[PDB]
Each structure stands twice: as structure tokens, then as C-alpha cells.
């Protein structure tokens, strides 16, 4: 008949949560506050990322109920933290600044975009003070009531200049699973985001995941295959976000074409602050180029795919975002060390019916960045010396709906968000952790009872 | 057949009935190697301790169901059919381990108790009986 | 009889001679689950490592006194009476484990050595002898 | 003969063939006992976890080469001579373990695989065959 | 003890309070059934800006 | 206070300062440890 049997080694898993540790490659050298990013304490990857495709398997995933994104998000916060524990605490900066304009080109093609501020400051000696001066981007200075100004995050947060040894260059991170667990990767080129993925594989641990911080635009991400997938748990809901993932890396060239000078001010003892000494070179405006042709064609591919969720009898409109906080209004990202806020009006400005040249994006440069919408904390990037030229793909999109009022053909979508955990779900959607239970009870003609 | 880690997941239970060791090996990962607080350091150690803890829980379970000669334990006592009674072909010609656990998920804690109590106690004290002559 | 954890503490040794497993199960506590420094965090982990360390010390001792088929190990060699010589009724009709350990507390390290050396070495190399024909 | 920990290092392999346990005991050091961050504290714990991790790796290896009745495992299948073929006297009358490992250091990962696969799989499913009559 | 500690690591360190306080009585009920039991103290104090100070009470 | 002229530096009575100041922070050891070296035994884990 059928009787009870015990096995050990039964390839069976459960959906579970557990902790996942980093796995990297040995390239830990940079020049802004510690290391490369945090990743030099990492265990070196196996030179053979062994995988195995699992025949016949069918497991439902839920890229919207996955937990790995949560661990990842907390850990990235904390690593940013640890990189910011040990370097200088810039509290005595929050001082009344005497600022004037920087007379940029007559009449105005930089509109200043930076003010020239002198101020009092402590010295090496807790004694007779010094008068220094520095150039600040008028986007991070605020008025009161020359005129007296101050740092923006000061009456709300403390600030913590990153010293010059870490990078911000994202380095491929490999989330690795401790023994007794397993990482499942959906091998299906065509996957909505959830539900049963038929073609799956197991890996000991994942691919390199460039942990780029970006808004409205997935940079350096992975690319989709044979289509440009759309992912969201409830498209019919207007309160989620649409995750578009391209086939073709649409280039973007961003640059800051200034030779900027690093002026060191000793907030003694021993602590030193890097201010913007001056700017030399072609004073253009920081910006980004994109091939209009490829963007238009690929966004038409997107038109097709958005249609496939709304009917071949519709008209879709891409508008720019509807205003608000800076960190959501723009394509914010990090690049060569600096922090870019690109206005994207020039990219969602078109309604679309049922059926070189290049686009220039004018971006501004911020300093006192408040990362992860967290308040009470504030990193202060240092003026990166030299000229910045930085090239990248844009592989995906993060859109928000406002329609379902007179909802027939004309839908309007605008970009936005502000939670990186979207960015993170865009590359872990194929991944799921399972706990292994190598203990098994099953019936065969081995026999025991109650 | 060299399937690999979980390689017989998409196979009938009798198929996986030969590739048991492959999962067992992965219960330490060897070289793993996985310095102050060091985020990912606490993670490394908490991982390893979790792994051995996990391992030892089930190895303990097997210690209790005293076999230690694992992958197969068999006695001569019949089995209770009440728990989702099914056919032989309904298992080996109709089911893989995955689908099987979905159905057996209820009776686990039950089974654990009697496999623990019954054979251990019966096989106990009989060795005590035969330690006389 | 289902006494429970230490349930046979107030019983003669032959009584507890049936409820051995109940203590063994508590050697992991399962779900225990027991975040920065987090006082009670270091405590949690230091606890778990202490537990498995404790477990493995004695499991090692049993590995050495090679049985692994625990709760009973028996051979055919006599026993030394010098160590607090007492009667059978003085043990099973007069003593519980608690009172017993108080009296045996002296000879432990002695006993450990010969159970380790003698049978291991004798049972060794005889398997080496019978590996010929 | 009571050599001690590694006491038979300067001896032919057949000599050390009797003092195996002495190293095994030192795999926990007992009392070790080895409070905030406390340099040497992290060291203490990282040490202990390393120790048990080390122990469990090889105990796992032995679990796989399923003996658990350690110090000797023997079957009836011949052995491959290709791997640094040498004489009996070239080993027991000419070599100590130290010199031996220098020569065998190449074939280790090879040997691990077949001792793992071959006997485990063959001795498997034959118990499954004799679980019928 | 240590838990009290950990709860007290991360919140504000009030060192710049230790400043000369200008205190008067709080005229509680005439004549006295609170005897004050509290004084009214004004003092100098730093500000958001490590600059021109403020007078609080 | 009286300072050993080996750890004070000039500028340009005359005004002087601590030496490691324009380069490092300083951290007075309080009065409970020693510096008396005590035999340390490096011990090896099992
Ligand atoms: C999406 O992903 C893509 C890749 O997939 C990313 O693209 C990366 O973008 C970054 C940002 O620019 C590039 O890194 C930086 O490139 C700088 C430009 O130098 C390059 O061009 C010059 C002139 O042609 C060459 O001479 C350079 O080659 C030499 O230098 C590099 C780096 O030192 C060496 O590796 C080579 O062997 C050559 O020796 C480059 O090809 C470059 O200045 C910069 O190097 C600084 O930064 C790194 C890390 O930040 C430091 O480790 C390094 O030591 C340098 O920093 C010190 O030196 C400068 C010298 O002046 C000082 O000023 C600094 O203060 C500091 O002391 C870095 O190489 C990167 O190359 C590029 N990827 C690839 C594959 O090319 C995108 O960034 C990413 N998306 C986003 C949004 O970022
Ligand atoms: C960001 O910025 C980078 C660098 O500025 C851009 O990368 C350049 O992209 C362009 C566009 O394709 C490349 O230009 C083309 O290169 C082809 C291959 O290069 C060979 O030929 C050139 C001569 O043109 C040689 O110098 C070189 O060594 C190679 O042997 C050429 O075949 C192309 O020429 C053809 O098209 C042009 C029309 O433009 C005709 O006039 C020609 O006669 C010919 O038919 C063209 O030159 C360029 O090579 C890339 N840079 C580099 C260093 O190679 C990114 O495109 C830019 N991204 C954005 C979004 O702006
Ligand atoms: C810090 O920098 C500020 C400017 O950035 C300096 O502020 C100046 O302070 C002096 C006093 O030291 C002010 O002089 C005053 O002028 C009034 C009217 O003339 C007079 O009645 C006072 O007796 C006093 O002399 C001066 O106006 C003021 N200037 C500004 C623009 O605010 C300050 O001196 C700097 N401190 C140090 C230590 O460097
Ligand atoms: C995804 O979000 C949409 C909303 O955009 C959800 O649809 C909404 O579902 C609720 C109930 O589930 C509907 O409430 C009631 O619906 C009935 C029938 O439509 C209606 O007669 C009632 O008056 C009441 O409105 C709601 O209308 C509906 N809205 C839309 C726009 O469809 C949908 O359920 C979400 N997805 C999932 C899987 O739940
Ligand atoms: C920001 O504004 C300040 C003024 O508040 C600028 O500082 C002053 O800039 C002038 C020229 O731009 C320097 O002039 C020099 O003065 C010396 C002595 O009077 C003279 O011998 C030289 O021939 C030359 O005329 C002046 O030194 C400088 N003052 C300080 C304290 O630096 C500053 O240049 C502005 N920032 C930028 C980036 O332009
Ligand atoms: C992002 O970039 C867009 C353009 O790509 C900026 O929108 C532009 O804003 C200006 C000022 O609001 C608009 O000018 C308007 O012109 C009319 C006609 O002369 C005048 O009557 C209005 O009073 C206003 O001055 C301009 O049309 C508009 N461009 C587009 C394409 O709509 C936008 O301000 C930028 N936002 C950020 C946050 O960078
Ligand atoms: C996205 O594109 C739209 C359309 O170009 C921009 O909206 C426009 O924004 C301008 C100001 O930036 C609005 O001008 C208005 O002027 C009146 C009169 O001075 C003022 O009282 C209002 O407060 C407002 O500033 C304009 O009405 C508005 N038009 C529309 C149709 O939205 C928007 O600024 C762009 N945003 C980005 C981030 O590109
Ligand atoms: C901090 O608060 C204290 C009181 O809580 C203030 O103390 C006052 O300080 C002023 C000087 O700024 C003293 O004025 C002095 O008066 C003498 C005699 O009239 C005169 O010879 C001096 O030249 C000077 O003008 C005043 O007496 C003193 N009052 C008390 C009660 O101590 C202090 O001003 C506050 N500081 C700040 C920055 O708010
Ligand atoms: C998820 O993928 C499925 C198909 O793989 C999409 O449609 C499903 O269609 C079946 C009918 O064959 C329904 O029973 C399912 O309920 C549908 N899925 C969902 C999630 O509702 C589906 O559109 C995809 N999900 C999204 C959000 O696009
Ligand atoms: C897309 O447009 C077509 C025709 O304009 C509609 O008709 C479908 O066409 C597809 C071809 O890709 C067929 O596979 C379907 O069977 C057709 N169905 C019907 C009902 O005609 C189609 O409905 C449109 N799709 C949407 C989502 O509106
Ligand atoms: C965005 O789309 C509009 C409409 O297609 C383009 O046309 C501009 O519309 C504004 C509206 O007031 C006019 O003021 C401009 O004069 C129009 N443009 C021109 C060249 O005349 C507009 O050009 C598009 N801009 C971008 C950046 O996409
Ligand atoms: C965008 O992603 C593409 C992925 O194709 C990157 O393309 C790589 O380009 C190098 C040199 O051109 C090739 O050696 C690689 O093989 C390409 N990748 C692949 C997967 O084939 C491209 O580098 C990315 N964009 C930028 C700016 O780096
Ligand atoms: C086989 O299993 C069934 C149920 O799966 C057992 O039935 C139990 O019988 C006892 C004694 O009357 C009741 O107290 C329980 O309530 C019954 N179980 C359930 C789920 O109601 C049956 O006893 C088992 N076989 C043997 C021989 O004990
Ligand atoms: C039984 O135990 C007794 C003591 O408990 C052993 O007596 C030992 O004999 C050796 C050999 O003469 C002496 O060196 C020891 O000093 C004795 N022990 C004590 C405590 O003094 C006796 O040898 C044991 N039985 C056997 C057969 O060895
Ligand atoms: C004994 O070992 C030798 C080598 O040490 C084995 O020779 C292998 O034979 C296979 C089958 O032809 C080849 O693929 C390998 O390349 C050989 N090994 C080497 C190192 O070249 C031999 O097979 C072993 N004995 C048996 C019975 O398999
Ligand atoms: C303020 O409170 C004190 C608290 O006792 C009052 O104390 C006075 O102390 C002086 C000592 O120099 C005595 O001479 C007075 O008789 C005390 N007063 C009383 C009411 O006992 C003091 O009077 C209070 N001052 C005011 C203005 O209320
Ligand atoms: C993009 O191309 C389509 C046709 O391929 C055209 O209808 C549309 O106008 C183009 N975009 C713009 C902004 O002109
Ligand atoms: C297991 O128990 C759940 C609890 O409701 C029940 O829904 C399911 O049908 C049960 N399955 C079997 C095979 O007993």
C-alpha cells in the first residue's frame, strides 16, 4: 500500500524571509569619504556564478509583495550611514552668510545660479576668528525675513560632509544567501511582475546590482527582452506606479563643463571643509543630451504597450510632473560624484492618437542633499574638482496615472515618485528567497504508524 | 543523473528519490568567509549562526526519530490512511514533491509526535531487556 | 508517562529511565528568533552560540565514546566497584538522579578517560584486522 | 601510548593510527568562556563561531561519506593506483602523515567526489529494495 | 542600567544649558500654599545659528 | 600650567600652542588604566 517514510535531502522550499549578505569583487579604491561605496568589507564573489535552470517548475512570484526589497532598502540606508559616521561634522557652518551675486554672463545665461558668500568661521584655535568665502549654488541657500542668508537644512537637520575617500560610483553588489536558503530567478522573458513564472532557475546568489540612486528614470538598470514590459500590481488603480522596462539602452550624455577649484578651509583642529574656490572654463549650463529619434521611437513602443492595457481605441498623453518638492519634480541622480536634478518637461510633452537632432535637458546642481526623504540628516557632497562628463542608459520608467474621469480615450500619465524602493523592485522582480526544509515525510512502502 | 541543487524539483517524488545529497551539501557552502560593526559583518555572522541553527534543528529532529542513517527510515508497523488518503499512482505517477507538501502541510506536527514517541519508547527498554542474557 | 521537561526529577533513576527525550527536545527551543548593537541583541546571539556550543561539547563526548545511538551504551567488560560501592536497591529503590550525582561527582573525569581510551582503541584496529578476509 | 595533542606528529602513520582521539578532544577546549564591543569580545565570539563552523564542515563531510562511526570506513571495492602509486613499506616504513599529505594534496577534491557519490548512491535504494520482503 | 543607557544615547545632549540663570520667585498663592516650589528663570542661549544669541525663559 | 618645551610651538610674552593641534585632536587618558605591560597570552581557538 502506502505507508510512512522519512527522507533527508528533499528538494522542497517555502516562501520565507531571511537575511542576505553582500558579495562583491575586489576594486575598492575611490576618493570621497571611506572606500568605494561601503563595499570593501564584502566577501569576494565566487569566480563561477553557478546557476541552474529548473525544468518543469511553476512558482508564483509577487514582485509587489517581496521582502528582499525591504532588507535591501534598509541596508543601503545604513551603509550610507556608516560611511557618514566618521567624517567631519559641519555644525559650525550654520552661520550668517554675507552673500552677493556672481555676475555670470551679461545679461544672464547662468542667471548666477550661484551666490558668492563670505562668512565668519572658527579657526584651528578656539579663538580669534577668520573671514573666509565660498561659492554656493543658490538652490541650497535661504534668505531671512548685502542680504543675510544661510544653509537650508540647518534649521531642521545637522550636516555631515563626506570626506574624500569613498565613491558614489555604484559597484555591482551581489546579494547572497546564507546556507540553507535559495534564490529563485524567473527565467521568463515575458513576465508581468506577478503570478506563476513557468521558466525559473536557482542560483546561489544574484547578479551585480548597480545600486544607483535615481528618480523618474531607471539608470544603468537591466534591460528587458524582445519587448518593453510594463509592471504594476493594479494597473486599473491610479494609485500605483507603472514600471516600464526598455529593450534598448537609450543613451543620455550628462555633463558639468566647469573646471572648479577646491578651496580648503580648516575648521580646526584637524577638520577641514572643501568649498567651491572658483569656476574656470566654458561656463555652459549643466545639462544632458539625448537622441530625439530613439527616444521618440522607443516611447512609441511604450505607446503600444500602454495601449495593450487600455485598448487600441485610446489616446495617451505624457505630461511633465505636476509640481511639488524638488526631489520628485526632476530626474535626480548621482553622476561622477555630483548630484543632478534634470527637469524632464522636455521628455513628457506629447499626446498620442490611437494610430541629429537631440533633446537638451537643463539640469541644476544641488549640494545639501537629503537622502531617502529622511529629515534630520544631511550629507554635504564636496565640490568635485575638474570637468564632469558622464554617460548612461535609461532603461525604464516610473509613471503615475490621473485618469478615470471621462475615461474613454484620452489618458494622461506623468512621471514622479520619490521612493527608491521602486528602483529596487525593478531589478529584484525576478528574484525570490526560499527557505529549504531538507526534512521530509512522505508515504512509500516504509511503514511506521501512530 | 546529475541534476544539481534542487535539480529534481520539477520531477516526480520517485525521481528526486535519488538526488538527495545535492541539497545537503549546500548546507555549509564551505569557503563562505561570511573589522568593526561593519554592516554586512553582523549580517555575515548572524547568517552563519542562522544556518547552523537551522541545520541543527532538523538534525535534532532526526536524532530524535533515531535513525542518523538518514534518507530512509523503515519499520514494520502499518500507516494511518486517514490523512488525505491517496493512491500509489496518485503519488509517483501523479505528483511531485512540491504538490505533495501542499497536501501534507496539515498533519506534520501530528506525525512528528508519534514518530518521536512510539518507536523511541518501544525500541527503548527492550535493549534493556536483552541486556540480561 | 508524560511527565515533561525534567518531569522525572523527583523520581528514582529507573523512573526517569523512560523520559529522556523530553529534555533533549528543549536543546533548541525552535522558533526562538533570539538591528544595531541592541542590548538583548548581543545577548540573543551570545545565547544561541552558547547553546549550540554546549550541545556540541557533549555530543562530541558521545562521539568519542562512540555510540551515537544514545541513551544506552553497553559492552561486556566488568565495572570497577571502588568508586562509592553501593547496592542495586541502594540505587533504584533508594536513590533518584539528583542524590546520585552528589555522590558520583568525584569520579567523572576518571570515567571519561577510560571510556574514551579503552573501548575506542580496542574496537579500533580489529575492524582493521577483519578487513582482510 | 599517551603522546598528547599532535603527539604522534613525528611518527609513522601507523603509529599515529592509535592516538586519534587526542586531537578530537581539543575541538572545543571546554571552559573557554571566550561587556560592550570590547576588543577581544568580538574576537572571542568570532573565534567560537569559527571553531564550530570548522568542526561542522568536516563533520558534514563525514555525514556525507556516511559513516559517523569515524576513524575507520571500509568497504570491499578496489582502489585506484594512478594517484602517486607507492609501496606499503613506502608508507608505513617510510612515511609519516606530514610527508604524506604533501604528496596527496592534489587528489583530495577528486576523492571527495566519488566517496560522496558512489557508495552513498549504491547503498541507497538497495535498502529501498530490501524494504519489500 | 544599560537599557536606560541605550535609550539615552541618541537624544539631545543638553550641555549648553549649564548657563547662569536669572531667576525670581513664582508668586504662588498668597501667602504661601505652594511656597513657590518653582522659580522663574530666564537665560541666554544659543540659537539655530551659532551666532547672535536669544533670551528665553 | 607648566609644559615641557618639547611639545609647544611658536607662532610667526610670546604666544605658543600645542603641537599636535593644527594636525590632530587630543584625548587625555583619565586616571584608571596603567601603561604597565601585563603578560598577554595569545591563545588559539579550538
Ligand atoms: C552608469 O554606468 C556607467 C558605466 O556603466 C557609469 O559611467 C561611469 O561614469 C563615471 C563618471 O565619470 C566614470 O568614472 C570616472 O571617469 C572620470 C573620467 O576619466 C575618464 O576619462 C579620462 C579622459 O579620457 C581617462 O584618462 C580616464 O582613464 C584614467 O582614469 C581612470 C580612473 O582614474 C582609470 O581607471 C584609467 O585606468 C585611466 O587611468 C577615464 O577613462 C575619471 O576622472 C574618474 O576617475 C576618478 O574617480 C574614480 C572614482 O570616482 C577614482 O577612483 C579615481 O581615482 C579618480 O578619482 C581621483 O582622481 C581624480 C584625478 O583628477 C581626482 O580629481 C579625484 O578627486 C580623485 O582624487 C572615473 O574614472 C566611469 O569611467 C564610467 N564608466 C565607464 C565604464 O567608463 C555611469 O556613471 C553610471 N551612471 C551614473 C548616473 O553615474
Ligand atoms: C555621447 O557622446 C559620445 C561621444 O561624443 C557619443 O558617442 C559617439 O556616437 C557617435 C554616433 O554614432 C559616433 O559617431 C559615429 O562613429 C561611427 C564609428 O566610428 C568610426 O568612424 C569614426 C569617424 O566618424 C572614426 O573616427 C572612428 O575611429 C571609427 O573608426 C562612424 O561610422 C560614424 O560616421 C558615419 O556617420 C556620420 C554621420 O554622423 C558620417 O558623417 C560619416 O561619414 C559616417 O557615415 C560616426 O562618426 C562616435 O564614434 C561616438 N564616439 C566615439 C568616441 O566613438 C554618444 O553618441 C553621445 N550620446 C548622446 C546621447 O549624445
Ligand atoms: C563676522 O562677520 C560679520 C560680517 O560677515 C562682521 O559683522 C560686522 O561686525 C562689526 C562689529 O565687529 C560691525 O560693526 C558695528 O558697526 C556699528 C555701526 O557701524 C557700530 O555701531 C558697532 O559699534 C560696530 O562697530 C559691523 O557693522 C558688522 N558688519 C556686518 C555687515 O554685519 C563681524 O565683524 C565678523 N566677526 C568677526 C569676529 O570676524
Ligand atoms: C485595482 O484598483 C481598482 C480601482 O481603480 C479596483 O476597482 C475597484 O473595486 C472596488 C471594489 O473592489 C469597486 O467598488 C465598487 O465597485 C462596484 C462594481 O464596480 C460598484 O458598483 C460600486 O459602486 C463600488 O464602486 C470600485 O468601483 C472599483 N473601481 C474601479 C475603477 O474599477 C480594483 O478592485 C483593484 N484591483 C483589485 C485586484 O482589487
Ligand atoms: C566674492 O566676493 C569677494 C568680495 O567680497 C571677492 O573677494 C575679493 O575679490 C577681489 C577681486 O575679485 C580681490 O581683489 C584683490 O585685492 C588685493 C588687496 O586689496 C589687491 O592687491 C589685488 O590686486 C586684487 O585687487 C580680493 O583679494 C578678494 N578678497 C578676498 C577677501 O578674497 C571674491 O573674489 C568673490 N568670489 C569670487 C569667486 O569671485
Ligand atoms: C521645466 O521646463 C519647462 C520647459 O521645458 C518649464 O516650463 C516653461 O515655463 C515658462 C515659465 O513658466 C513658460 O513660459 C510661459 O510663456 C508664456 C508665453 O510667453 C507666458 O505667457 C507665461 O506667463 C510663461 O512665461 C514656458 O512656456 C514653459 N515651457 C513649456 C514647454 O511649457 C518649466 O518651468 C521647468 N520647470 C522646472 C522645475 O525646471
Ligand atoms: C510642466 O509643464 C507645465 C506646462 O508648461 C508647467 O505649468 C505651468 O507652470 C507655470 C509656472 O512654472 C504656470 O504659470 C503660472 O503663472 C501665474 C501668473 O503669473 C501664476 O500665478 C501661477 O502660479 C503659475 O506660476 C502655468 O500656469 C502652468 N501651466 C500649466 C498648464 O500647468 C509646469 O511648470 C511644468 N513643470 C515642470 C516641472 O516642468
Ligand atoms: C545674557 O543674559 C544676561 C542676563 O541674563 C545679560 O547680562 C547683561 O549683560 C550686559 C552686557 O551685554 C550688562 O550691561 C553692562 O552693564 C554695566 C553696568 O551697567 C556696564 O558697565 C557694561 O558696559 C555693560 O553695559 C548687564 O549688566 C548684564 N545684566 C545682568 C543682569 O547681568 C547679557 O546681556 C545676555 N547676553 C546676551 C548675548 O543676550
Ligand atoms: C499577470 O499576468 C497575467 C497573465 O500571465 C495577466 O492576466 C491574467 O489573466 C488570467 C486569465 O488568463 C487571469 O485569471 C489573471 O487574474 C490575470 N492576472 C492578474 C494579475 O490579474 C495579468 O494582466 C498580469 N498582471 C498585470 C498586473 O498585468
Ligand atoms: C488592437 O487592435 C485590433 C485591431 O485594430 C483589435 O482586434 C484584435 O487584433 C489582434 C491582433 O493583434 C487579435 O489578436 C485579436 O483577436 C483582435 N480582437 C478583436 C476583438 O478584434 C484589438 O481588440 C485591439 N486591442 C486592444 C487591446 O484594444
Ligand atoms: C511641448 O509641446 C508643445 C505643444 O505641442 C510645443 O509647442 C509650444 O507650445 C507653447 C504653449 O504656449 C508655446 O508657447 C510654444 O511657442 C510652442 N513651441 C513653439 C516652438 O512655438 C512645445 O514646443 C513643446 N516643448 C517641449 C520642450 O517639448
Ligand atoms: C547600456 O547597456 C548596454 C548593454 O548592452 C551596454 O552595452 C555594452 O557595451 C560594451 C561596449 O560597447 C559591450 O562590450 C557590452 O557587451 C555591451 N553590453 C552587452 C550586454 O552587450 C552599455 O555600456 C550601457 N550604457 C553605457 C553608457 O555604458
Ligand atoms: C488515524 O487517524 C485518525 C484521524 O486522522 C484517528 O482518529 C482519531 O481517533 C481518536 C480516538 O477516538 C480521536 O480522539 C480523534 O479525534 C480522531 N482524530 C480526529 C482527527 O478526529 C485514528 O485514531 C488514527 N488511527 C489510530 C489507529 O489511532
Ligand atoms: C579500580 O579503582 C581503584 C581505585 O578507585 C584502582 O586503584 C588504583 O590502582 C593503581 C595501580 O596500583 C594505583 O596507581 C592507583 O593509585 C589506585 N587508585 C587510587 C584511587 O589510589 C584500581 O586499579 C581500579 N581497578 C583496576 C582493575 O584498575
Ligand atoms: C584511475 O585514475 C585515472 C587517472 O588518475 C583515471 O583516468 C581517467 O580516465 C578517464 C576516462 O578515460 C579520463 O577522462 C581522465 O582524463 C583520466 N584521468 C586523467 C587524470 O587523465 C582512471 O579512469 C581511474 N580509474 C577508473 C577505473 O576510472
Ligand atoms: C522669594 O522666595 C524666597 C524663598 O524663601 C523668600 O524668602 C525670603 O528670604 C529672606 C532671606 O534673605 C528673608 O529675609 C525673607 O523673610 C524671606 N521671605 C519670606 C516671605 O519668608 C523671598 O521673600 C521671596 N521673595 C519675594 C519677592 O517673594
Ligand atoms: C515621433 O514619431 C512619430 C512617427 O514615427 C510622429 O508622429 C511624432 O510626431 C514624432 N514625435 C514628435 C515629437 O514629433
Ligand atoms: C489542510 O488544512 C487547511 C486548513 O483549512 C484546509 O483548507 C486544507 O484543505 C487541508 N488540506 C488537507 C489535504 O487536509
Residue numbers in the entry:
A (entry chain I): 33 to 141, 150 to 185, 188 to 309, 312 to 321, 321A, 322 to 398, 411 to 505
B (entry chain J), C (entry chain B), D (entry chain F): 518 to 551, 566 to 664
E (entry chain A): 109 to 141, 150 to 173
F (entry chain E): 174 to 185, 188 to 221
Direct quotes from the study:
This bnAb binds the V3 glycan at site N332, with a footprint similar to that of the bnAb PGT128. The QA013.2 bnAb has previously been shown to potently neutralize tier two viruses from clades A, B, and C, as well as several tier three viruses from clades B and C, but it did not neutralize clade D or A/D recombinant viruses. The mature bnAb is only capable of neutralizing viruses that contain N301, N332, and the linear GDIR motif.
From the cryo-EM structure, it is apparent that QA013.2 interacts not only with the N332 glycan as previously reported, but also with the glycan at site N301, and the linear GDIR motif at the base of the V3 loop. Key regions of the antibody paratope include the CDRH1 and CDRH2 which are nearest the N301 glycan, as well as CDRH3 and CDRL3, which are in close proximity to the N332 glycan. We observe that the CDR loops of the heavy chain contain many polar and charged residues, which likely facilitate hydrogen bonding interaction with the Env glycans and the charged residues in the GDIR motif. The CDRH3 loop is distinctively long (21 residues) and appears to tilt away from the rest of the heavy chain toward the light chain, generating a cleft between CDRH2 and CDRH3 and exposing an extended interface that has been observed for other V3/glycan-specific bnAbs including 10–1074 and PGT121. Seven key residues in the Fab CDRH3 loop (L103 – I109) lie adjacent to the conserved GDIR motif. However, unlike many other V3/glycan-specific bnAbs reported in the literature, this bnAb emerging from HIV superinfection relies on residues that span FWRH1 and CDRH1 to achieve cross-clade Tier two heterologous neutralization, while residues in CDRH3 are less impactful.
